[PDB]
Amino acid sequence: MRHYEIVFMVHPDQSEQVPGMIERYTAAITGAEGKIHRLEDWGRRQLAYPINKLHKAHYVLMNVEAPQEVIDELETTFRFNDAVIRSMVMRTKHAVTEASPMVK
Amino acid sequence: ESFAQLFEESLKEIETRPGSIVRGVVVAIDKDVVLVDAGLKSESAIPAEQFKNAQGELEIQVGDEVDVALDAVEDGFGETLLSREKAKRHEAWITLEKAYEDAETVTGVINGKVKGGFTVELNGIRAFLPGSLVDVRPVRDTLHLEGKELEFKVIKLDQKRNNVVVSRRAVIESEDPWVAIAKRYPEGTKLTGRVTNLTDYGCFVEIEEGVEGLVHVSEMDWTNKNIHPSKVVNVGDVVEVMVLDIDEERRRISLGLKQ
């Protein structure tokens, strides 16, 4: 429908919970016949500045071709979920399946 | 008729833009201005200093032929950029010749490293090379008789920015500038750079593969303020300069000359 690109940052103490969260997110996307073109756990990462007093955080990239309702839902979930510190759902023109420059 | 049209495409065919075709005949000499005519719209105001060879006196009388250069047209009145750069292409060709047989042989004599590689001079010109290139091993030409005769065996060349370090003695043995701007960095790496334009606060020596250096007015000499850089150095000349400072961000490498 519309090709979004999502990057969310999880609190580093909840790093072991991340995979489950990712799975959940994927599931929702799948539900509305939404494809998920790339998905990249960047892992624990040093922040350029300390958001909410903490210096590292766990970054997950995820590209999705989904309807906007589901995106909205995801956003809502993120906002209420306290594990995820920041998110940045961000539209894109194409599917962009090729890997990110920091993974490579 | 189409005589002229054909003559035009003929004359297009029998010239090119760079200093390649040795065509300008020296048709008046006067100190301090040479002048040619390479089939261009006007005659060059040549310096005398693009034409004296290795000890200071002139070499070419009337009728003699050197190509100059091009791709710059009309600053008001006149035609060229200097033929001496011409010469650089010839030097490049000889350096390239190495590749064929994996060994360019001339003479290289390198006494010392301004910036970590002995300086080698070929014919009139002198070039700077990275520190390893001067010696094959750890021999070091400091114990060799000063300004000794070998050749140059090439150690390293930078391929974009022109720095070539060559192999003295041991005959038997045989986007782009700004990401990795850490090569000439570390505090004081001396460089050989041609100055371009002196902006009454500066001199703008800039050679190392698409960068910009200043050497502004404060150093330049050992007088501060009364100096006026046009009096004190040159126009278009390869000099002693080193970095003293790099900002890889606001591309201002601030070189010096008082060293």
């Binding site: - | 008001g76 400072d245 900002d247 606001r250 201002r252 601030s254």
Partner: protein, 70 residues
């Protein structure tokens, strides 16, 4: 303009470096600019005026240069 004195570096040199850094930043200039409120109009005017001046310097002066002074 965060700076650290290198091992066996002179004080004066360090100071100079710091100064240079500051200059690069344009921190002082920025401060000066934000001392008082500039009306948008005024800001616009300065920018355009400055531009005009620059243009004048570049072209008219170049034209003058073509002709010799003596």
């Amino acid at each position: 303009p965060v700076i650290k004195v290198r091992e066996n570096e002179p004080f004066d040199v360090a100071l100079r470096r710091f100064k240079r850094s500051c200059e690069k930043a344009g921190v002082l200039a920025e401060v000066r600019r934000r001392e008082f409120y500039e009306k948008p109009t005024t800001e616009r005017k300065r920018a355009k005026a400055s531009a005009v001046k620059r243009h004048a310097k570049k072209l008219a002066r170049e034209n003058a240069r073509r002709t010799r002074l003596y």
